Amino acid sequence: LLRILKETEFKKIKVLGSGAFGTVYKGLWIPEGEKVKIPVAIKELREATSPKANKEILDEAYVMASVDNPGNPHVCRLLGICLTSTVQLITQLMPFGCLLDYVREHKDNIGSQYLLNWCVQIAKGMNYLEDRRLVHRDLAARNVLVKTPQHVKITDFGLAKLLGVPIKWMALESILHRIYTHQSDVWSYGVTVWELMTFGSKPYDGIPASEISSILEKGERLPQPPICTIDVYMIMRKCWMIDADSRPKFRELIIEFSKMARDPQRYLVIQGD
Numbered sequence: 080l081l082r083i084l085k086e087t088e089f090k091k092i093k094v095l096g097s098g099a100f101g102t103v104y105k106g107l108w109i110p111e112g113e114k115v116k117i118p119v120a121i122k123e124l125r126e127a128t129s130p131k132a133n134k135e136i137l138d139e140a141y142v143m144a145s146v147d148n149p150g151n152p153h154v155c156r157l158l159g160i161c162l163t164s165t166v167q168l169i170t171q172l173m174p175f176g177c178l179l180d181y182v183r184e185h186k187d188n189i190g191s192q193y194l195l196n197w198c199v200q201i202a203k204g205m206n207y208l209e210d211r212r213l214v215h216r217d218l219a220a221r222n223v224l225v226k227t228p229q230h231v232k233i234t235d236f237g238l239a240k241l242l243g244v245p246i247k248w249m250a251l252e253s254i255l256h257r258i259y260t261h262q263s264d265v266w267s268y269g270v271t272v273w274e275l276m277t278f279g280s281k282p283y284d285g286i287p288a289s290e291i292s293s294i295l296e297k298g299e300r301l302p303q304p305p306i307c308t309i310d311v312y313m314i315m316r317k318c319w320m321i322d323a324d325s326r327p328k329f330r331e332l333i334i335e336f337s338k339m340a341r342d343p344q345r346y347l348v349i350q351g352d
C-alpha cells in the first residue's frame with residue numbers, strides 16, 4: 080500500500096534537482112524486512128508549509144495511497160513516506176526525469192506519434208484520477224515523468240490537497256478563487272499539451288503573473304503552435320473555456336488523441352516526418 084519509512088531505511092545520493100518546494104534526491108531505499116536495494120527519488124519538501132499536523136498529513140497520505148490500487152501505468156505510485164520535521168516522498172526512480180526536460184533536450188528528434196501518444200497516455204492517467212475523485216491541481220509537462228520514452232506517468236497529484244503557485248497552468252476559477260475540480264485539470268492539460276507542442280515553451284512567456292488573471296478575461300489564450308493543425312488547436316482552446324463544464328472530459332481526450340494518432344501526419348507537421 081505505502082510504507083512508513085524510518086530515517087535509517089533510505090539513503091541519499093545526488094540531488095536530481097532543486098526548486099522552490101524543496102529538493103529531489105536520487106538514492107537507495109531498503110524496506111523494513113527485505114534484502115532488496117531500491118533505486119528511489121526522494122522529494123524533500125520544505126518545512127513550515129502545512130498548517131496540518133504530521134498525523135493529519137500521514138492519514139491523508141494513506142487516503143491518497145488508495146489511488147495505487149488497481150493503479151494505472153500513467154499515474155505514479157508513492158513507494159513510501161518519511162515524516163521528520165519535513166515531508167520526504169519516496170517513489171521509484173525515473174532515470175529520464177520529467178517530460179518537459181525531455182521534450183526540450185530532444186526537440187528535433189521528437190516525432191508526431193511520440194507527441195500524440197504522450198497526450199493519449201497523459202489523458203488516460205488523468206482520467207484515472209477522475210475515476211478515483213483525486214484532483215491533481217498541478218498538471219504540467221514538468222509533473223509528467225518519463226519511465227521509458229514510450230511510457231509516461233503523472234506525479235505530484237493532490238499534493239496541494241495534502242498541504243496548503245503556477246498561475247499560467249491554472250484556470251480562471253483557480254487563479255481568482257482557488258477552486259480546484261477535475262474540470263480545472265482539463266485547462267491545465269490544455270496548457271500541458273501546448274507545452275509539448277512548443278517543446279518546453281513557457282506558457283504566456285514573459286507576461287507577469289499578476290497580469291495573467293485580467294489578461295485571460297480579455298479573451299487572450301495561449302498562441303497556437305506551428306506544428307498543431309487547426310483540429311488540434313480546437314482541443315487546446317476547448318480546455319481553456321471560461322465555464323468548467325464547457326471544457327471536455329478526460330474520457331473524450333483519450334478517444335480524440337488516439338483517433339488523432341491513427342494518422343499523425345494529418346495532425347502534426349514537422350521534419351523527418
Ligand SMILES: *CCC(=O)N1Cc2nc(-c3cccc(/C=C/c4ncc(C5CC5)o4)c3)n(-c3ccncc3)c2C1
Pocket residue numbers: 095096103119120121122140143144155157168169170171172173174176177178179180181221222224234235236237238241
Ligand atoms: C523535469 C524533471 C522534473 O521537474 N521532475 C519533477 C519531479 N518530481 C519527482 C518526484 C520525486 C519523488 C516523489 C515525487 C512525488 C510523489 C507524490 N506525488 C503525489 C503523491 C501522493 C499522492 C500524495 O506523492 C516526485 N521527480 C522524479 C521522480 C522519480 N525519479 C526522478 C525524479 C521529478 C522530475
